[PDB]
Design a protein around this motif. Structure first.
Motif, PDB file in Angstrom:
ATOM      1  N   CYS A 133      75.359  18.717  61.384  1.00  0.00           N
ATOM      2  CA  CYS A 133      74.075  19.383  61.170  1.00  0.00           C
ATOM      3  C   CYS A 133      72.985  18.693  61.972  1.00  0.00           C
ATOM      4  N   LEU A 134      72.933  17.371  61.902  1.00  0.00           N
ATOM      5  CA  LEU A 134      71.872  16.663  62.594  1.00  0.00           C
ATOM      6  C   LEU A 134      71.919  16.932  64.086  1.00  0.00           C
ATOM      7  N   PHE A 135      73.118  17.077  64.645  1.00  0.00           N
ATOM      8  CA  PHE A 135      73.225  17.247  66.075  1.00  0.00           C
ATOM      9  C   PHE A 135      72.762  18.636  66.489  1.00  0.00           C
ATOM     10  N   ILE A 136      73.085  19.667  65.702  1.00  0.00           N
ATOM     11  CA  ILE A 136      72.584  20.966  66.132  1.00  0.00           C
ATOM     12  C   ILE A 136      71.100  21.058  65.854  1.00  0.00           C
ATOM     13  N   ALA A 137      70.600  20.285  64.882  1.00  0.00           N
ATOM     14  CA  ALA A 137      69.165  20.216  64.617  1.00  0.00           C
ATOM     15  C   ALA A 137      68.438  19.504  65.739  1.00  0.00           C
ATOM     16  N   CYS A 138      69.005  18.409  66.217  1.00  0.00           N
ATOM     17  CA  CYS A 138      68.265  17.507  67.099  1.00  0.00           C
ATOM     18  C   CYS A 138      68.455  17.831  68.555  1.00  0.00           C
ATOM     19  N   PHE A 139      69.482  18.609  68.903  1.00  0.00           N
ATOM     20  CA  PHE A 139      69.734  18.836  70.326  1.00  0.00           C
ATOM     21  C   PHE A 139      68.478  19.341  71.038  1.00  0.00           C
ATOM     22  N   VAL A 140      67.729  20.222  70.354  1.00  0.00           N
ATOM     23  CA  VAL A 140      66.600  20.844  71.043  1.00  0.00           C
ATOM     24  C   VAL A 140      65.532  19.802  71.356  1.00  0.00           C
ATOM     25  N   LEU A 141      65.444  18.729  70.529  1.00  0.00           N
ATOM     26  CA  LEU A 141      64.503  17.648  70.800  1.00  0.00           C
ATOM     27  C   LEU A 141      64.808  16.999  72.139  1.00  0.00           C
ATOM     28  N   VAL A 142      66.068  17.004  72.531  1.00  0.00           N
ATOM     29  CA  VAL A 142      66.447  16.429  73.810  1.00  0.00           C
ATOM     30  C   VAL A 142      65.883  17.263  74.946  1.00  0.00           C
ATOM     31  N   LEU A 143      66.100  18.567  74.848  1.00  0.00           N
ATOM     32  CA  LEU A 143      65.698  19.454  75.919  1.00  0.00           C
ATOM     33  C   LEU A 143      64.184  19.427  76.073  1.00  0.00           C
ATOM     34  N   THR A 144      63.475  19.362  74.941  1.00  0.00           N
ATOM     35  CA  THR A 144      62.022  19.294  74.961  1.00  0.00           C
ATOM     36  C   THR A 144      61.558  17.988  75.574  1.00  0.00           C
ATOM     37  N   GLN A 145      62.217  16.878  75.226  1.00  0.00           N
ATOM     38  CA  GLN A 145      61.831  15.603  75.817  1.00  0.00           C
ATOM     39  C   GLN A 145      62.041  15.646  77.323  1.00  0.00           C
ATOM     40  N   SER A 146      63.163  16.230  77.742  1.00  0.00           N
ATOM     41  CA  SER A 146      63.401  16.438  79.157  1.00  0.00           C
ATOM     42  C   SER A 146      62.226  17.136  79.812  1.00  0.00           C
ATOM     43  N   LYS A 147      61.737  18.191  79.186  1.00  0.00           N
ATOM     44  CA  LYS A 147      60.628  18.916  79.819  1.00  0.00           C
ATOM     45  C   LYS A 147      59.377  18.053  79.884  1.00  0.00           C
ATOM     46  N   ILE A 148      59.124  17.242  78.847  1.00  0.00           N
ATOM     47  CA  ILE A 148      57.946  16.376  78.898  1.00  0.00           C
ATOM     48  C   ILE A 148      58.040  15.399  80.070  1.00  0.00           C
ATOM     49  N   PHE A 149      59.231  14.859  80.336  1.00  0.00           N
ATOM     50  CA  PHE A 149      59.365  13.913  81.437  1.00  0.00           C
ATOM     51  C   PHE A 149      59.240  14.631  82.774  1.00  0.00           C
ATOM     52  N   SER A 150      59.851  15.791  82.914  1.00  0.00           N
ATOM     53  CA  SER A 150      59.632  16.543  84.133  1.00  0.00           C
ATOM     54  C   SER A 150      58.141  16.805  84.319  1.00  0.00           C
ATOM     55  N   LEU A 151      57.469  17.256  83.272  1.00  0.00           N
ATOM     56  CA  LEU A 151      56.060  17.590  83.462  1.00  0.00           C
ATOM     57  C   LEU A 151      55.277  16.375  83.893  1.00  0.00           C
ATOM     58  N   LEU A 152      55.509  15.243  83.247  1.00  0.00           N
ATOM     59  CA  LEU A 152      54.826  14.001  83.643  1.00  0.00           C
ATOM     60  C   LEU A 152      55.168  13.595  85.064  1.00  0.00           C
ATOM     61  N   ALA A 153      56.447  13.637  85.423  1.00  0.00           N
ATOM     62  CA  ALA A 153      56.814  13.349  86.803  1.00  0.00           C
ATOM     63  C   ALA A 153      56.038  14.229  87.771  1.00  0.00           C
ATOM     64  N   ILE A 154      55.838  15.496  87.416  1.00  0.00           N
ATOM     65  CA  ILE A 154      55.231  16.405  88.373  1.00  0.00           C
ATOM     66  C   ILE A 154      53.783  16.030  88.578  1.00  0.00           C
ATOM     67  N   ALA A 155      53.102  15.684  87.491  1.00  0.00           N
ATOM     68  CA  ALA A 155      51.698  15.351  87.599  1.00  0.00           C
ATOM     69  C   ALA A 155      51.543  14.112  88.471  1.00  0.00           C
ATOM     70  N   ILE A 156      52.467  13.152  88.332  1.00  0.00           N
ATOM     71  CA  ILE A 156      52.429  11.906  89.113  1.00  0.00           C
ATOM     72  C   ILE A 156      52.756  12.156  90.580  1.00  0.00           C
ATOM     73  N   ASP A 157      53.711  13.046  90.836  1.00  0.00           N
ATOM     74  CA  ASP A 157      54.030  13.482  92.181  1.00  0.00           C
ATOM     75  C   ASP A 157      52.819  14.058  92.901  1.00  0.00           C
ATOM     76  N   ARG A 158      52.086  14.960  92.257  1.00  0.00           N
ATOM     77  CA  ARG A 158      50.933  15.544  92.944  1.00  0.00           C
ATOM     78  C   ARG A 158      49.779  14.538  93.059  1.00  0.00           C
ATOM     79  N   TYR A 159      49.696  13.585  92.144  1.00  0.00           N
ATOM     80  CA  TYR A 159      48.692  12.551  92.266  1.00  0.00           C
ATOM     81  C   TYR A 159      48.973  11.647  93.459  1.00  0.00           C
ATOM     82  N   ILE A 160      50.231  11.300  93.665  1.00  0.00           N
ATOM     83  CA  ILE A 160      50.600  10.558  94.856  1.00  0.00           C
ATOM     84  C   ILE A 160      50.329  11.395  96.091  1.00  0.00           C
TER      85      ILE A 160
END
Ligand SMILES: Cc1c(C#N)cccc1-c1cc(-c2cn(Cc3cccc(C(C)(C)O)n3)nn2)nc(N)n1
Ligand SMILES: CC(C)CCC[C@@H](C)[C@H]1CC[C@H]2[C@@H]3CC=C4C[C@@H](O)CC[C@]4(C)[C@H]3CC[C@]12C
Ligand SMILES: CC(C)CCC[C@@H](C)[C@H]1CC[C@H]2[C@@H]3CC=C4C[C@@H](O)CC[C@]4(C)[C@H]3CC[C@]12C
Ligand SMILES: CC(C)CCC[C@@H](C)[C@H]1CC[C@H]2[C@@H]3CC=C4C[C@@H](O)CC[C@]4(C)[C@H]3CC[C@]12C
Ligand SMILES: CCCCCCCC/C=C\CCCCCCCC(=O)OC[C@@H](O)CO
Ligand SMILES: CCCCCCCC/C=C\CCCCCCCC(=O)OC[C@H](O)CO
Ligand SMILES: CCCCCCCC/C=C\CCCCCCCC(=O)OC[C@H](O)CO
Ligand SMILES: CCCCCCCC/C=C\CCCCCCCC(=O)O
Ligand SMILES: CCCCCCCC/C=C\CCCCCCCC(=O)O
Ligand SMILES: CCCCCCCC/C=C\CCCCCCCC(=O)O
Ligand SMILES: CCCCCCCC/C=C\CCCCCCCC(=O)O
Length: 387
Positions: free
Chosen positions: A79-106
């Motif tokens: 149960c916990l794994f099907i509950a928590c999997f989506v937290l992974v995908l969302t965290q992934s998106k947060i890191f991509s978004l942050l990377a992108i902002a840093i890329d354009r700042y550079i």
């Protein structure tokens, strides 16, 4: 109480509609980058990591959400794994978004060094590193920060659950202090505020650079006035020295600035000898160099900075719609957690807030198509050629 299968049926039909559109739309994003080498830059590798996460929402996280809304008897940790999997995908998106902002700042702060600093091989290593941390952050409950040690045994019995099982419900197995302190405050809000600071710094940078240009341009044209209208040697020398630094400073295309500074040196030399009218007339040869080389740099430079500003605004709209789609649900958890005297948000609103968060996985394709010409043009080809 209305048969719960009537609300569930609506919620589920909607989830599937959203999963379909998440898949299609983000597949198109990937197909577009695959096919147009003008989209194969580092920035868009993060766009692609983002679209992969959103494909995975439709293919896995939405079916998981449908599953864990039934309360089905399940082994607590599965149960916990099907509950928590989506937290992974969302965290992934947060890191991509942050990377992108840093890329354009550079890109806007040190354009000159960007291609030797921000390489496709390092981007891929950052993406991989971010996916792995996303698995560690979103599956941390598995590591023991969970409620599986204190199941609801009454509830599990009333559903005939096996032994060791629980009725499988997100909020029964994922602790709410994880969700609020760790996930929301620390893994979501802190990075969003960072991204806010970075896009601030990007717009400030661009705004300062455009003014610098417009200043340099005016230093160039006003110091000419000082030359045309002098009757003394040193007035001409002074105004020329102030064009030369404003020329070298703008330099930081070459035929244009060589001539320009060379003609300024020509006129400086004349002015040091006291040849006022001969320096004034050599200065006037600069104006010819302005019209043909320098004003065309001013304008292409302006045009590039306006494009970076427009691009950075397009990417910040991605981050704002991320915040809009996810904050309600976060805000609900904060009430669940911080206000045990408050009634729990009603089922219907949970339905609304969950489906809202999932629609984020539909919106990015539309942003690209509405705001990025290269994506929009590619999207049209792909549709026509393969209707
Ligand atoms: C995951 C997450 C993130 C991320 N990433 C960020 C913020 C909050 C959340 C999040 C998500 C879910 C959730 C619940 N469900 C299954 C489901 C579907 C329909 C109805 C129901 C019932 C039983 C009625 O409640 N349950 N799916 N997601 N629930 C809560 N509190 N928080
Ligand atoms: C490559 C992709 C498609 C693989 C997907 C595998 C998914 C669907 C699998 C892997 C782990 C699985 C879970 C593992 C354990 C349990 C506990 C059991 O009591 C009910 C099913 C449940 C909750 C499983 C549901 C399905 C599950 C989430
Ligand atoms: C980010 C933008 C879209 C703003 C979103 C704010 C939303 C999520 C706010 C506005 C009003 C809020 C509700 C106001 C009252 C209650 C009753 C309380 O007993 C539980 C919380 C609950 C149910 C709140 C949940 C969150 C809520 C619905
Ligand atoms: C930039 C903004 C969106 C950041 C997020 C703001 C969050 C942390 C704020 C917005 C409104 C706040 C809520 C307003 C009211 C209450 C009721 C109180 O009895 C417990 C705290 C609680 C539940 C607050 C918790 C924190 C909260 C949810
Ligand atoms: C299952 C869940 C998700 C599927 C993952 C999709 C992964 C997406 C890969 C597509 C790809 O690499 O295209 C972009 C490149 O051309 C960049 O140059
Ligand atoms: C292509 C990739 C496709 C992805 C797989 C799709 C959905 C996964 C969700 C399925 C989870 C269902 C669990 C049902 C269950 O375990 O029910 C038994 C329970 O004990 C009560 O009888
Ligand atoms: C930026 C968001 C940070 C906001 C922090 C909100 C904390 C809420 C809080 O402290 O609530 C205590 C609770 O009421 C105990 O009775
Ligand atoms: C926001 C994104 C779009 C939302 C569109 C409609 C939302 C989908 C389901 C919300 C309501 C589902 C159940 C309605 C009330 C019946 C019930 O709660 O039992
Ligand atoms: C492929 C698309 C799959 C979509 C959702 C799967 C829904 C799973 C239903 C859970 C079972 C309910 C139960 O066992 O009581
Ligand atoms: C492509 C992959 C296909 C994935 C299979 C789809 C989901 C199956 C639905 C699970 C329902 C479980 C039945 C529960 C029960 O009988 O108690
Ligand atoms: C591109 C794919 C990246 C692969 C990343 C894999 C790294 C996983 C990181 C930490 C996971 C922690 C949770 C482990 C789940 C164990 C299941 C259990 O407890 O029974």
């Amino acid at each position: 109480g209305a048969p719960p299968i009537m609300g569930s049926s609506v919620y589920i039909t909607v989830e599937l509609a959203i999963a379909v559109l998440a898949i299609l739309g983000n597949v198109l994003v990937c197909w577009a980058v695959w096919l147009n080498s003008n989209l194969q830059n580092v920035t868009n590798y993060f766009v692609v990591s983002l679209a992969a996460a959103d494909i995975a929402v439709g293919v896995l996280a939405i079916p998981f959400a449908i599953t864990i809304s039934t309360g089905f008897c399940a082994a607590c940790h599965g149960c916990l794994f099907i509950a928590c999997f989506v937290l992974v995908l969302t965290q992934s998106k947060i890191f991509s978004l942050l990377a992108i902002a840093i890329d354009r700042y550079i890109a806007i702060r040190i354009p000159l060094r960007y291609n030797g600093l921000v390489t496709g091989t390092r981007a891929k290593g950052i993406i991989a590193i971010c996916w792995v941390l996303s698995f560690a952050i979103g599956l941390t409950p598995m590591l023991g920060w969970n409620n599986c040690g204190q199941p609801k045994e009454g509830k599990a019995h009333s559903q005939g659950c096996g032994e060791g099982q629980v009725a499988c419900l997100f909020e029964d197995v994922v602790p709410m202090n994880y969700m609020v302190y760790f996930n929301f405050f620390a893994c979501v809000l802190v990075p969003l505020l960072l991204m806010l600071g970075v896009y601030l710094r990007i717009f400030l940078a661009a705004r300062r650079q455009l003014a610098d240009l417009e200043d340099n341009w005016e230093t160039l044209n006003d110091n000419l006035k000082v030359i045309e209208k002098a009757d003394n040697a040193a007035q001409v020398k002074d105004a020329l020295t102030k064009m030369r630094a404003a020329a070298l400073d703008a330099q930081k295309f070459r035929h244009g600035f060589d001539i320009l500074v060379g003609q300024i040196d020509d006129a400086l030399k004349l002015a040091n000898e006291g040849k006022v009218k001969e320096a004034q007339a050599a200065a006037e040869q600069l104006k010819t160099t302005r019209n043909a080389y320098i004003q065309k740099y001013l304008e292409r430079a302006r045009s590039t900075l306006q494009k970076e500003v427009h691009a950075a605004k397009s990417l910040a709209i991605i981050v704002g719609l991320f915040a809009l789609c996810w904050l309600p649900l976060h805000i609900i958890n904060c009430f669940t957690f911080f206000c045990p005297d408050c009634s729990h948000a009603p089922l219907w609103l949970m339905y609304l807030a969950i489906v809202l968060s999932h629609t984020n996985s539909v919106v990015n394709p539309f942003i690209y198509a509405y705001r990025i010409r290269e994506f929009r043009q590619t999207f049209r080809k792909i549709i026509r050629s393969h209707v």
